[PDB]
Amino acid sequence: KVFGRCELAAAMKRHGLDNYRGYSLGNWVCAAKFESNFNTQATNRNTDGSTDYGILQINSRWWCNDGRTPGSRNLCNIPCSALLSSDITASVNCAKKIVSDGNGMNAWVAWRNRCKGTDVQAWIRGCRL
Ligand SMILES: [N]
Ligand SMILES: [N]
Ligand SMILES: [Pt+2]
Ligand SMILES: [Pt+2]
Ligand SMILES: [Pt+2]
């Protein structure tokens, strides 16, 4: 599923991401835009052989099992394919564990490089949430 901007903001609000560990909804919408272009199906292979999955590009190195990432962990205890559903529940639940692990949203390279310290409120402008 390719979400619209306000459609995803509404879904992320429903699943408890608004102000989750102090990160406004605009931060999460910004992160999703630059990680996946709002596409639940997005996959990208990393240089270390791990792959990033779904709307928030959750990495097999630490968070999910994709059956082809040697010596990695599965800290969200999910198959990485669960992260590609039109339903964002698995991605949200796993993102809450990630953002809570001490590094906050710095885990998301696209957030650090394109969202951090910008006017993220612009990402929810006009949205009926
Ligand atoms: N949702
Ligand atoms: N969720
Ligand atoms: Pt839709
Ligand atoms: Pt939902
Ligand atoms: Pt939920």
UniProtKB/Swiss-Prot annotation:
Q: Which GO terms describe its cellular component?
A: cytoplasm; endoplasmic reticulum; extracellular space
Q: What class of enzyme is it?
A: hydrolase
What keywords are assigned to this protein? Answer: Allergen, Antimicrobial, Bacteriolytic enzyme, Disulfide bond, Glycosidase, Hydrolase, Secreted, Signal
Q: What is its EC number?
A: 3.2.1.17
- Where is the protein localized? Secreted
The UniProt record gives the binding positions of substrate as 101
Q: Which SMART domains match?
A: LYZ1
Q: Which reactions appear under catalytic activity for this entry?
A: Hydrolysis of (1->4)-beta-linkages between N-acetylmuramic acid and N-acetyl-D-glucosamine residues in a peptidoglycan and between N-acetyl-D-glucosamine residues in chitodextrins
Q: List the disulfide bonds.
A: 6-127, 30-115, 64-80, 76-94
Give the quaternary structure: Monomer.
The protein here is known as Lysozyme C
Q: Provide the species name.
A: Gallus gallus
Cite the source lineage: Eukaryota, Metazoa, Chordata, Craniata, Vertebrata
State the encoding gene. Answer: LYZ
